[PDB]
Write an enzyme that holds these catalytic residues in place. Structure first.
Site, short mmCIF file in Angstrom:
data_model
loop_
_atom_site.label_atom_id
_atom_site.label_comp_id
_atom_site.label_asym_id
_atom_site.label_seq_id
_atom_site.Cartn_x
_atom_site.Cartn_y
_atom_site.Cartn_z
N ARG A 9 1.73 1.17 15.32
CA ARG A 9 1.54 0.95 13.90
C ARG A 9 1.77 -0.51 13.53
N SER A 48 -1.96 26.45 -5.50
CA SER A 48 -1.81 27.88 -5.70
C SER A 48 -2.42 28.32 -7.03
N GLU A 94 11.46 12.92 0.54
CA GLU A 94 10.28 12.19 0.05
C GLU A 94 8.99 12.95 0.32
N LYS A 117 3.28 30.10 3.61
CA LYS A 117 2.53 29.58 2.46
C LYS A 117 1.03 29.54 2.73
N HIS A 148 0.83 -1.21 0.00
CA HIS A 148 0.00 0.00 0.00
C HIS A 148 0.86 1.25 0.00
N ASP A 197 8.88 21.24 -26.39
CA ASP A 197 8.95 19.91 -25.81
C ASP A 197 9.78 20.00 -24.54
N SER A 204 14.34 6.24 -12.47
CA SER A 204 13.33 6.98 -13.22
C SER A 204 13.14 8.39 -12.67
N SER A 205 13.11 8.53 -11.35
CA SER A 205 12.95 9.85 -10.75
C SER A 205 14.19 10.71 -10.95
N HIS A 230 12.61 12.74 4.56
CA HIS A 230 11.95 14.04 4.56
C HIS A 230 11.99 14.75 3.21
N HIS A 289 13.97 14.01 12.57
CA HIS A 289 12.73 14.08 13.32
C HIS A 289 11.94 12.78 13.28
N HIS A 290 12.34 11.83 12.45
CA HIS A 290 11.79 10.48 12.48
C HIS A 290 12.60 9.53 13.34
N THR A 340 6.21 27.30 5.80
CA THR A 340 4.97 26.65 5.42
C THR A 340 3.77 27.42 5.97
N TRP A 358 6.92 0.18 5.25
CA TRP A 358 7.31 1.15 4.24
C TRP A 358 8.81 1.38 4.26
N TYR A 411 8.80 16.16 0.86
CA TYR A 411 8.64 17.44 0.18
C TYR A 411 8.54 17.32 -1.35
C1 HEA Z 1 2.66 14.30 3.17
C2 HEA Z 1 3.75 13.91 3.78
C3 HEA Z 1 4.18 14.66 4.98
C4 HEA Z 1 4.21 16.07 5.30
C5 HEA Z 1 3.90 17.38 4.65
C6 HEA Z 1 4.78 16.08 6.65
C7 HEA Z 1 4.98 17.26 7.30
C8 HEA Z 1 5.49 17.37 8.56
N1 HEA Z 1 5.86 16.30 9.34
FE1 HEA Z 1 5.78 14.39 8.89
N2 HEA Z 1 5.71 12.47 8.42
C9 HEA Z 1 5.28 11.91 7.26
C10 HEA Z 1 4.80 12.60 6.19
C11 HEA Z 1 4.70 13.96 6.15
N3 HEA Z 1 5.05 14.84 7.13
C12 HEA Z 1 5.36 10.44 7.27
C13 HEA Z 1 4.92 9.72 6.03
C14 HEA Z 1 5.93 10.08 8.57
C15 HEA Z 1 6.24 8.76 9.22
C16 HEA Z 1 6.87 7.72 8.31
C17 HEA Z 1 7.34 6.56 9.14
O1 HEA Z 1 7.26 6.65 10.39
O2 HEA Z 1 7.79 5.54 8.57
C18 HEA Z 1 6.09 11.42 9.19
C19 HEA Z 1 6.60 11.50 10.45
C20 HEA Z 1 6.80 12.67 11.11
C21 HEA Z 1 7.36 12.63 12.48
C22 HEA Z 1 7.77 11.44 13.29
C23 HEA Z 1 6.67 11.06 14.26
C24 HEA Z 1 7.12 9.80 14.93
O3 HEA Z 1 6.93 8.71 14.35
O4 HEA Z 1 7.68 9.89 16.04
C25 HEA Z 1 7.39 14.04 12.79
C26 HEA Z 1 7.87 14.71 14.02
O5 HEA Z 1 8.79 15.51 13.92
C27 HEA Z 1 6.89 14.78 11.63
C28 HEA Z 1 6.79 16.14 11.59
C29 HEA Z 1 6.31 16.83 10.51
C30 HEA Z 1 6.23 18.30 10.53
C31 HEA Z 1 6.68 19.05 11.75
C32 HEA Z 1 5.68 18.68 9.25
C33 HEA Z 1 5.38 20.01 8.65
O6 HEA Z 1 6.08 20.17 7.40
C34 HEA Z 1 3.92 20.36 8.45
C35 HEA Z 1 3.84 21.79 7.92
C36 HEA Z 1 2.42 22.14 7.55
C37 HEA Z 1 1.82 23.23 8.04
C38 HEA Z 1 0.41 23.54 7.64
C39 HEA Z 1 2.57 24.15 8.98
C40 HEA Z 1 1.63 24.72 10.03
C41 HEA Z 1 1.44 26.20 9.81
C42 HEA Z 1 0.25 26.79 9.99
C43 HEA Z 1 -0.93 25.97 10.42
C44 HEA Z 1 0.07 28.27 9.77
C45 HEA Z 1 -0.22 28.99 11.08
C46 HEA Z 1 0.83 28.63 12.10
C47 HEA Z 1 1.26 29.49 13.03
C48 HEA Z 1 0.70 30.88 13.11
C49 HEA Z 1 2.31 29.03 13.99
N4 HEA Z 1 6.53 13.92 10.64
C1 HEA Z 2 0.10 8.52 -0.77
C2 HEA Z 2 0.23 7.87 0.37
C3 HEA Z 2 -0.93 7.29 1.07
C4 HEA Z 2 -2.35 7.37 0.84
C5 HEA Z 2 -3.30 8.05 -0.11
C6 HEA Z 2 -2.92 6.53 1.91
C7 HEA Z 2 -4.27 6.36 2.03
C8 HEA Z 2 -4.89 5.60 2.98
N1 HEA Z 2 -4.23 4.90 3.95
FE1 HEA Z 2 -2.29 4.79 4.24
N2 HEA Z 2 -0.35 4.68 4.55
C9 HEA Z 2 0.64 5.27 3.84
C10 HEA Z 2 0.47 6.09 2.75
C11 HEA Z 2 -0.76 6.40 2.24
N3 HEA Z 2 -1.97 5.98 2.71
C12 HEA Z 2 1.97 4.93 4.39
C13 HEA Z 2 3.20 5.50 3.75
C14 HEA Z 2 1.75 4.06 5.52
C15 HEA Z 2 2.75 3.41 6.45
C16 HEA Z 2 3.03 2.00 5.96
C17 HEA Z 2 3.88 1.29 6.98
O1 HEA Z 2 3.58 1.40 8.19
O2 HEA Z 2 4.85 0.61 6.58
C18 HEA Z 2 0.28 3.97 5.53
C19 HEA Z 2 -0.32 3.22 6.48
C20 HEA Z 2 -1.66 3.05 6.59
C21 HEA Z 2 -2.17 2.20 7.67
C22 HEA Z 2 -1.36 1.49 8.71
C23 HEA Z 2 -1.56 -0.01 8.72
C24 HEA Z 2 -1.10 -0.42 10.10
O3 HEA Z 2 -0.27 0.31 10.68
O4 HEA Z 2 -1.59 -1.44 10.62
C25 HEA Z 2 -3.60 2.30 7.44
C26 HEA Z 2 -4.72 1.68 8.19
O5 HEA Z 2 -5.67 2.33 8.57
C27 HEA Z 2 -3.79 3.17 6.28
C28 HEA Z 2 -5.01 3.48 5.77
C29 HEA Z 2 -5.19 4.29 4.70
C30 HEA Z 2 -6.55 4.57 4.21
C31 HEA Z 2 -7.73 3.97 4.92
C32 HEA Z 2 -6.37 5.43 3.07
C33 HEA Z 2 -7.35 6.09 2.18
O6 HEA Z 2 -7.15 7.51 2.18
C34 HEA Z 2 -7.37 5.56 0.76
C35 HEA Z 2 -8.19 6.55 -0.04
C36 HEA Z 2 -7.28 7.32 -0.97
C37 HEA Z 2 -7.33 7.07 -2.28
C38 HEA Z 2 -8.28 6.03 -2.78
C39 HEA Z 2 -6.45 7.81 -3.25
C40 HEA Z 2 -7.28 8.19 -4.46
C41 HEA Z 2 -6.91 7.40 -5.70
C42 HEA Z 2 -7.78 7.20 -6.70
C43 HEA Z 2 -9.17 7.76 -6.64
C44 HEA Z 2 -7.35 6.41 -7.91
C45 HEA Z 2 -6.49 7.30 -8.80
C46 HEA Z 2 -7.24 7.59 -10.08
C47 HEA Z 2 -7.34 8.83 -10.58
C48 HEA Z 2 -6.71 10.00 -9.88
C49 HEA Z 2 -8.10 9.04 -11.86
N4 HEA Z 2 -2.60 3.61 5.79
CU CU Z 3 10.38 14.22 7.78
#
Ligand code: HEA
Ligand code: HEA
Ligand code: CU
Ligand code: TGL
Ligand code: PC1
Ligand code: PC1
Ligand code: PC1
Ligand code: 3PE
Ligand code: 3PE
Ligand code: 3PE
Ligand code: 3PE
Ligand code: 3PE
Ligand code: CUA
Ligand code: MG
Ligand code: NA
Ligand code: ZN
Lengths: 260, 44, 94, 227, 57, 76, 514, 47, 79
Positions: free
Chosen positions: G438, G255, G242, G319, G61, G91, G156-157, G240, G290-291, G316, G126, G244
């Site tokens: 998890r 935007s 990944e 933004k 998944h 192109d 590819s990327s 991280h 931070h992870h 952010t 993952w 961004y």
């Molecule tokens: C879409 C992917 C995505 C994005 C954008 C982010 C964004 C951020 N992530 Fe996360 N993160 C993940 C995907 C992502 N992360 C995944 C996939 C993991 C776990 C994977 C794994 O465990 O294997 C993870 C795990 C993860 C952890 C580890 C938790 C743990 O397992 O212990 C932490 C903690 O530092 C963290 C922090 C953050 C922070 C601080 C941001 C920030 O960038 C968010 C910024 C967004 C904002 C909107 C900022 C808020 C600002 C406002 C709301 C404006 C107003 C604010 C003020 C006036 C102060 N992330």
């Molecule tokens: C892009 C990243 C992404 C997205 C969309 C999702 C979507 C969802 N994830 Fe995902 N999830 C992860 C990334 C993502 N997850 C990762 C990275 C983990 C950690 C794995 C690990 O622990 O190793 C995780 C783990 C994770 C768990 C943890 C399992 C466990 O710890 O036991 C669970 C269970 O609830 C879960 C549930 C869901 C659900 C219910 C959705 C729903 O939101 C699904 C609905 C979203 C969609 C269906 C997308 C839309 C797509 C289409 C409509 C088709 C495309 C076609 C066109 C655009 C035309 N996710």
């Molecule tokens: Cu990170």
């Protein structure tokens, strides 16, 4: 006359697809070589990717020098893309050096807390790595001489320079393999052996790629492909070989002088 | 963004056909697997 | 004497044609930003095209971040919508 | 130890958890503040009827949008820094207990005197005695006395585990070849339940951790009695 | 080693519609055919081998 | 002038430098007849968790029987 | 004709068409994996027996919805259609390796599918964390096939990043500087730079893992002098980024849709917009630990990394505030893409603040890898990137194919999606605070009810996906054309035609003489 | 020109027959949705 | 000296939580204590505190492997 812009319109080429499926074949061949010990599909994948790269670069030469599609703005794009690939591989080897320093700065309790790990005497840096560095530095200065011979217009001088550089590079590769034969220990032997064999082996693959690319540019010159200004093949040769030189300098200094 | 009229307008039946077909056809895989999940589990 | 071949007699094709264009000083294939910065009614901005219909992207204020793109067709000097500087199209067939 | 329809955290046993929950409610006030702000501002941009699509002024309010979240994050992170600093203050380790995470189970050693070692599996659903809990019961509790900071050295044998007790407020990743140091403290006797939080194979969900917190005298009574 | 690039260039600006990757005569056409039959022939061998590993004896 | 300077540096600095480094290694390789170190079965050396995908799975790709002992000893 | 045009593709528009097809197929696969997870988690007990297969399904998944859906849809697909049409390029710079990166993606997906087929399974999560991926716990092949799929996706990327940076900095019209392009071009430029300086670290880590498994090296074996913490360092120095890469094209396209459907001819704070893009791109490197708040790091390093996490949090916030400002004072047209963008803004806000709560390491000492972080990255990823994808999908579909979408049915798809995914991902806050770690198949009484509610919401999300693909069929069957496109004077991609002809920009854009 | 262009003709599939498009979209997305279910029943049969 | 404690105290040499280096250093200088005071004729029981500290810090499997390596002569330390 149909295309107003100075950029290049690429005809549909199958070799993207065939190189992609050759990468598929290479990965699957590595899988069935590591697990189900079949050499055949690995050899097939190697043949497919080597041949695909062969006529892919043949076709890009054909549109470059036989059709003149390498317009100077496309040449600028080629220079940018080449520098981007070089800095990507710089970060690749930087990740390798990060692994090496993560092993190095904090020696583990298994190794006795001492670097180099006990049980091995590392090869001394004084003779054979000095020979390595002298070969690569001589190759780099000879490439600079060849490029300025392109600037002047001296074909015989740059042929002599290119044969000298390729002789040095093949000498470096063969004695690289020779000291691989004549080192006291192996890749599957300790974290030290693992890390420097992995780093030096990736560097050996890269200097093999650079040597073959020098073969390509020399054989292109011997058929009068390069000119005074549009010589991006040799520009890429100089860039890649200076990348090899600075990576070998970094690897040499770090591995052979830190904890040795 | 103004849009020109549908060249092939879909009728109530056509809309029903697409909607029902999409739902049932897409549910078929999961539904059939879920119904026979125990059978698959059997090492037999 | 010559040794290595020199591109002014070696290279042929699009690269050669634009070397010829560069050495006679005019660029017909849009290597460089254009000329004649004058956008009045009586003297509009001259736009070269091999066809009768071509995009122009007006940065119509200095250091303006967003571009105003609009088409030119063969005929009168169409003007930029958000500023009003004029553009007239000339066919080159080159 | 978790109850159904749980909204916040499992209640505190350690003063580090008391400060952790106070700081957690602080961060909850910040997220509710910002969320209510962005909700009401969004409702302004939905429900308005006036239009301003002119040449905008840019650098007039961005200085406020730079200085305000900066001090928001400063007063968020200063308690964060203070708590993170007080996790590892000048310790008085009255006891040292080491955990070794094995393949989908745990082992525990009280080796400070009269070397003690035992194991910890998970009591199966069909083998549960009546009244117990599913997936959190363990055939051998981990015995520790209250009102003491005890060093806890956490490592693993084969695969990365993660010793986590969210009731007492701990989680350290058990890595092979590297033992991590934590301190257990408690303000309350009784049973606390946690799990392994790192994936470790075919029975990852099947290794929990159970802490029974007893007085001192019963702790050495148990230690001298189980041998 | 003589200069035959300018004669080789005029074997590449024929407006016959033959594409650039087949413009070198018949030899590159045979190389095209051989690499097209053997990446696909390798691919079908790989998919068959992955299927044979996925379904054991 | 640049090309002539680089030609002079290659012929009068780089080639003599490679000659001196080659002579250094060549003289050392004739005097050094290394006393193969005694085999010690250190648990952190010669680790084999999986056989290699070539030969017997126990010889490294660049194995040298004279200097590279197996997990069991030298081969002689 | 078909093999010459699609199998032998050489232009960005058809390559992006094939990207969209592969992204939709990968989205279907991941959607089925998600309903597998929630059907196994909607019932207390073991539906699938031992949860090794459950770990296989969660790994599949994660991989298919990250490295096969969102990257080929936004970074691959939307960018590969748009950025030549955005900058006026005819192109892309290197269309041959563009097509190579495309046709090398389905071999990576085939490696993933065959790895799932192999009996060993991808029971690592993952992350492919050793020594779980080592030969002691996965003596087999499936983890090797996943790592080789990782190699193929990485190559590819990388080639896509080369092509994107080259086409962005090269094929600008010569009088406009770097800071005059539209915001999606800037977002995908920073995305491709992040790709280029991130992916070789991934390649080093996964090659290192391959040589540890097969070539008997001991880089992550502590019995050989190695250290797994090196693998978490490498993998999260890629991880991280990944984040961004998966987020920044979403910033660009949201935007664009807010500045398109707000009636503005300028996004608010565009100069500061680009500053914040470059800021989060530059601090994406220095925030990687931070992870790893629970692996046993230094207290000073933990403090430095959480401080840098606040410093990457602030732009952010710039933004988000600039998005509210470009919403400000605008005649908000109620197109479905605007609804998707509003949902993105709010749910991104709440997910980011959840991320801040995570970013406090004193909270991650108890909160690491519970379902609270699952709620984090699904609030910010399963609606951040996904809501951006649907916003760009329903915005640019008349440009992409020529058939517009019915507004009522598109807002219907948005409505079922919105309510279902909110019901899906709001209870994992309570699951994480209560403390369910998890990658668990079975779960006690205290998590039963919220896990059930999340499963029902996930089935609602499945119904929404069915509505989306019915909407695709309905557009393809009704075949209504485009009468006109507003704001085409500002958006360069729309003025060339809906859909544009095969060879775009045969006449280059007359840049201003100034 | 060399390739046919127009509304809906730039897709790799045919658009003219709505029912044929429905059938082929059905088999495409059905294969996509059914692939991991067939995977998991394959390991259930294997184990 | 002849100090009798119940648990190993806080060592200021390693303020961080990665105490495997602490146990490694304790075992190393415990064996250094053995060889040094057996060579010099001093009392070997002075570093019974070093024995107790490495026993308290690092696990029984690790110390058993290290003792076997010491006993049959393959240890990687400076002993
Ligand atoms: C879409 C992917 C995505 C994005 C954008 C982010 C964004 C951020 N992530 Fe996360 N993160 C993940 C995907 C992502 N992360 C995944 C996939 C993991 C776990 C994977 C794994 O465990 O294997 C993870 C795990 C993860 C952890 C580890 C938790 C743990 O397992 O212990 C932490 C903690 O530092 C963290 C922090 C953050 C922070 C601080 C941001 C920030 O960038 C968010 C910024 C967004 C904002 C909107 C900022 C808020 C600002 C406002 C709301 C404006 C107003 C604010 C003020 C006036 C102060 N992330
Ligand atoms: C892009 C990243 C992404 C997205 C969309 C999702 C979507 C969802 N994830 Fe995902 N999830 C992860 C990334 C993502 N997850 C990762 C990275 C983990 C950690 C794995 C690990 O622990 O190793 C995780 C783990 C994770 C768990 C943890 C399992 C466990 O710890 O036991 C669970 C269970 O609830 C879960 C549930 C869901 C659900 C219910 C959705 C729903 O939101 C699904 C609905 C979203 C969609 C269906 C997308 C839309 C797509 C289409 C409509 C088709 C495309 C076609 C066109 C655009 C035309 N996710
Ligand atoms: Cu990170
Ligand atoms: C041209 C003349 C007709 C040629 C034969 C057409 C039928 C067979 C074929 O080769 O058919 C073509 C193939 C194309 O598939 C591939 O190329 C494989 C990709 C992996 O079709 C498929 O396999 C199935 C596609 C079903 C519909 C998918 C809809 C996706 C919607 C989302 C994207 C919209 C983008 C709008 C823009
Ligand atoms: C390896 C051979 C490199 C030869 C380079 C010189 C040359 O002949 O170039 C023209 C050739 C193409 O020649 P051509 O296109 O004029 O045609 C050759 C065929 N005849 C003459 C019979 C019509 O270009 C190349 O060989 C490209 C370089 C290939 C590099 C491969 C590296 C190793 C594999 C990866
Ligand atoms: C990949 C496609 C595999 C199709 C397949 O083997 O289906 C057999 C499977 C049947 O295998 P099965 O083992 O589940 O069958 C037991 C049920 N009976 C005997 C009543 C048929 O068919 C389906 O799953 C139906 C798919 C309908 C669409
Ligand atoms: C990471 C940070 C910490 C580590 C790095 C920083 C600290 C260490 C930095 C050291 C830099 C200087 C090292 C000098 C070592 C000198 C001793 C030595 O190596 O002796 C071995 C030997 C000793 O030989 P010898 O010079 O005594 O030879 C005498 C010969 N007879 C007896 C016949 C007179 O070699 C040398 O000293 C140098 C040999 C090569 C000299 C010529 C140059 C060759 C070409 C080079 C490239 C040219 C490109 C143009
Ligand atoms: C690993 C994969 C990557 C290897 C390195 C690739 C480097 C590519 C550099 C850029 C190539 C390119 O397109 O250069 C442009 C040039 C055409 O321009 P030019 O010839 O200068 O101008 C004509 C003058 N009128 O075109 C050329 O120069 C075309 C030829 C470039 C490549 C020649 C062959 C290089 C072989 C490298 C891989 C070898 C693999 C096998 C050996 C090692 C096995 C481990
Ligand atoms: C029952 C499912 C089929 C319903 C068929 C039907 O009633 O079709 C009529 C209508 C046509 O589409 P309509 O909703 O009018 O589109 C808005 C125009 N912009 O379609 C609908 O109203 C669709 C109703 C779907 C209900 C579920
Ligand atoms: C309409 C409802 C159809 C339905 O639920 O049918 C029951 C059937 C149960 O499947 P099962 O128990 O395996 O028995 C099938 C006979 N071999 O269910 C199935 O086979 C799955 C039907 C899925 C329908 C989705 C619409
Ligand atoms: C949406 C808002 C942003 C995300 C908030 C995530 C955190 C969260 O919802 O935590 C649950 C919170 C605190 O729970 P609490 O009521 O304090 O539990 C112990 C005492 N009953 O409780 C609440 O937030 C109250 C219930 C949900 C309100 C929305
Ligand atoms: C491994 C894959 C190697 C692929 C590769 O290097 O292909 C060469 C690539 C194609 O040449 P390109 O510039 O795209 O051609 C259009 C202009 N005539 O060449 C280029 O795009 C320029 C050099 C890129 C090198 C990338 C190496 C990877
Ligand atoms: Cu041990 Cu999960
Ligand atoms: Mg963890
Ligand atoms: Na379950
Ligand atoms: Zn203007």
């Amino acid at each position: 006359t149909h295309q107003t812009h100075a950029y290049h319109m690429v005809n549909p080429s199958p070799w993207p697809l065939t190189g992609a499926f050759s990468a598929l074949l290479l990965t699957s061949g590595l899988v069935m070589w590591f697990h189900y010990n079949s050499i055949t599909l690995l050899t097939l994948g190697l043949l497919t990717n080597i041949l695909t790269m062969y006529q892919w670069w043949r076709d890009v030469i054909r549109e470059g020098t036989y059709q003149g599609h390498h317009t100077p703005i496309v040449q600028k794009g080629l220079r940018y893309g080449m520098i981007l690939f070089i800095v990507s591989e710089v970060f690749f080897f930087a990740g390798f050096f990060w692994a090496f320093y993560h092993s190095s700065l904090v020696p583990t309790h298994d190794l006795g807390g001492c670097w180099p790990p006990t049980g091995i005497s590392p090869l001394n840096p004084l003779e054979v790595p000095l020979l390595n560095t002298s070969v690569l530095l001589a190759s780099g200065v000879s490439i600079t001489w060849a490029h300025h011979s392109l600037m002047e217009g001296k074909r015989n001088h740059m042929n002599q320079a290119l044969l000298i550089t390729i002789m040095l590079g093949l000498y470096f590769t063969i004695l690289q393999a020779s000291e691989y034969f004549e080192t006291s220990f192996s890749i599957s032997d300790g974290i030290y052996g693992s890390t420097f064999f992995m780093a030096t082996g990736f560097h050996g693959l890269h200097v093999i790629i650079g040597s073959t690319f020098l073969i390509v540019c020399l054989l292109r010159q011997l058929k009068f492909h390069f000119t005074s200004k549009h010589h991006f093949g040799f520009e890429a040769a100089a860039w890649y070989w200076h990348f090899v030189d600075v990576v070998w300098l970094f690897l040499y200094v770090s591995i052979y002088w830190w904890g040795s | 963004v103004h849009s020109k009229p549908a060249r092939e307008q879909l009728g109530v039946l056509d809309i029903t056909i697409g909607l029902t077909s999409c739902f049932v056809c897409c549910l078929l895989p999961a539904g059939w697997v879920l119904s026979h999940l125990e059978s698959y589990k059997k090492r037999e | 004497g010559g040794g290595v071949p020199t591109d002014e007699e070696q290279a042929t094709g699009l690269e050669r044609e634009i070397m010829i264009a560069a050495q006679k000083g005019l660029d017909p294939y849009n290597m460089l930003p254009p000329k004649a910065a004058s956008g009045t009614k009586e003297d509009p901005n001259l736009v070269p095209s091999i066809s009768n219909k071509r995009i122009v992207g007006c940065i119509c204020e200095e250091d303006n971040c967003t571009v105003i793109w609009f088409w030119l067709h063969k005929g009168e000097s169409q003007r930029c919508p958000n500023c009003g500087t004029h553009y007239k199209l000339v066919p080159h067939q080159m | 130890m978790a109850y159904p329809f749980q909204l916040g955290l499992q209640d505190a046993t350690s003063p580090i958890m008391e400060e952790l929950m106070n700081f957690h409610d602080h961060t909850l006030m910040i997220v509710f503040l910002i969320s209510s702000l962005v909700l009401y501002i969004i409702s302004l941009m939905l429900t308005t009827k006036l239009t301003h699509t002119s040449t905008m002024d840019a650098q007039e309010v961005e200085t406020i949008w730079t200085i305000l979240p900066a001090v928001i994050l400063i007063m968020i992170a200063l308690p964060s820094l203070r708590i993170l600093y007080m996790m590892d203050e000048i310790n008085n380790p009255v006891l040292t207990v080491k955990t070794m995470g094995h393949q989908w189970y745990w082992s525990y050693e009280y080796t400070d005197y009269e070397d003690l070692c035992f194991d910890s599996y998970m009591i199966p659903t069909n083998d549960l005695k009546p009244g117990e809990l599913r997936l959190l019961e363990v055939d051998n509790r981990v015995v520790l006395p209250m009102e003491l900071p005890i060093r806890m050295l956490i490592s693993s044998e084969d695969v990365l585990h993660s010793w986590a007790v969210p009731s007492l407020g701990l989680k350290t990743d058990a890595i092979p070849g590297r033992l991590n140091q934590a301190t257990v403290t408690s303000n309350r006797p009784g049973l606390f339940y946690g799990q392994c939080s790192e994936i470790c194979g075919s029975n990852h969900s099947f290794m929990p951790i159970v802490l029974e917190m007893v007085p001192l005298k019963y702790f050495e009574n148990w230690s001298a009695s189980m041998i | 080693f003589e200069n035959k690039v300018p004669e080789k260039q005029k074997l590449f600006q024929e407006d016959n519609g033959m594409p650039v990757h087949l413009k070198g005569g018949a030899s590159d056409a045979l190389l095209y055919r051989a690499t097209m039959a053997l990446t696909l022939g390798g691919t079908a061998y790989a998919i068959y081998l992955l299927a044979m590993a996925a379904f054991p004896k | 002038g640049s090309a002539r300077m680089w030609k002079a540096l290659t012929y009068f600095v780089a080639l003599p430098g490679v000659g001196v480094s080659m002579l250094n290694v060549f003289l050392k390789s004739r005097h050094e007849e290394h006393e193969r170190p005694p085999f010690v079965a250190y648990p952190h050396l010669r680790i084999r968790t999986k056989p290699f995908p070539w030969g017997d799975g126990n010889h490294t790709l660049f194995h040298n029987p004279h200097v590279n002992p197996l997990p069991t000893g030298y081969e002689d | 004709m078909f093999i010459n045009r699609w199998l032998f593709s050489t232009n960005h528009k058809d390559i992006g068409t094939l990207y969209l097809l592969f992204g939709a197929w990968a989205g279907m696969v991941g959607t089925a994996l998600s309903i597998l997870i929630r059907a196994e988690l909607g019932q207390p007990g073991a539906l699938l027996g031992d949860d090794q297969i459950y770990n296989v399904i969660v790994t599949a998944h994660a991989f298919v919805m990250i490295f096969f859906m969102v990257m080929p849809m936004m970074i691959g697909g939307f960018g590969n259609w748009l950025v030549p049409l955005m900058i006026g390029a005819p192109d892309m710079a290197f269309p041959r390796m563009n097509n190579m990166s495309f046709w090398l993606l389905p071999p990576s997906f085939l490696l993933l599918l065959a790895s799932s087929m192999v009996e060993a399974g991808a029971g690592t999560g993952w992350t492919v964390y050793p020594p779980l991926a080592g030969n002691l716990a996965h003596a087999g092949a499936s983890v090797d096939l996943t790592i080789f799929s990782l190699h193929l996706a990485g190559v590819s990327s990388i080639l896509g990043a080369i092509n994107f940076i080259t086409t962005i900095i090269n094929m600008k019209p010569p009088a406009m500087t770097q800071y005059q392009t539209p915001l999606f071009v800037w977002s995908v430029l920073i995305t491709a730079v992040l790709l280029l300086l991130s992916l070789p670290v991934l390649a080093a880590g996964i090659t290192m893992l391959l040589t540890d498994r097969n070539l008997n090296t001991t880089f992550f074996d502590p019995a050989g002098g190695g250290d797994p913490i090196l693998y978490q360092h490498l993998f999260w120095f890629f991880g991280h980024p990944e984040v961004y890469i998966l987020i920044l094209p979403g910033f660009g396209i949201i935007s664009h849709v807010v500045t398109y459907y707000s009636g503005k001819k300028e996004p608010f704070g565009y100069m500061g917009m680009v500053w914040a893009m470059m800021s989060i791109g530059f601090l994406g490197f220095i925030v990687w630990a931070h992870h790893m708040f629970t692996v046993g790091l230094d207290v000073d390093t933990r403090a430095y990394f959480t401080s840098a996490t606040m410093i990457i949090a602030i732009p952010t916030g710039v933004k988000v505030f600039s998005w509210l400002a470009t919403l400000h004072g605008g005649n908000i047209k109620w197109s479905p893409a605007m609804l998707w963008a509003l949902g993105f803004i709010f749910l991104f806000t709440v997910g980011g603040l959840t991320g801040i709560v995570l970013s406090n390491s004193s909270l991650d000492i108890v909160l690491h890898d519970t379902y609270y972080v699952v709620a984090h990255f699904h609030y910010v990823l399963s609606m951040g990137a996904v809501f951006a994808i649907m916003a760009g999908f329903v915005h640019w579909f008349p440009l992409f194919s020529g058939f517009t979408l019915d507004d009522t049915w598109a807002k219907a798809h948005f409505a079922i999606m919105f309510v279902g995914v909110n019901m899906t991902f709001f209870p994992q806050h309570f699951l994480g605070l209560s403390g369910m770690p998890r990658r668990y198949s079975d779960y006690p009484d205290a998590y039963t009810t919220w896990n059930t509610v999340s499963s029902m919401g996930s089935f609602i999300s499945l119904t929404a996906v069915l509505i989306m693909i019915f909407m695709i069929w309905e557009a393809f069957a009704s075949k209504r054309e485009v009468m006109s496109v507003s704001y085409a004077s500002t958006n360069l991609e729309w003025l060339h035609g809906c859909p544009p002809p095969y060879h775009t920009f045969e006449e280059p854009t007359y840049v201003k003489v100034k | 020109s060399h390739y046919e262009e127009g509304p809906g003709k730039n897709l790799p599939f045919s658009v003219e027959n709505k029912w044929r498009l429905l059938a082929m979209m059905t088999v495409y997305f059905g294969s996509g949705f059914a692939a991991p279910f067939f995977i998991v029943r394959h390991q259930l049969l294997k184990k | 000296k002849i100090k009798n404690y119940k648990t190993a105290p806080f060592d200021s040499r390693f303020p961080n939580q990665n105490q495997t280096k602490n146990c490694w250093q304790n075992y190393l200088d415990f064996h250094r204590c053995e060889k040094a005071m057996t060579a010099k004729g001093g009392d070997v029981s002075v570093c019974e505190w070093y024995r107790r500290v490495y026993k308290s810090l690092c696990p029984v499997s690790w110390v058993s492997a290290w003792d076997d390596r010491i006993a049959e002569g393959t240890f990687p330390g400076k002993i």
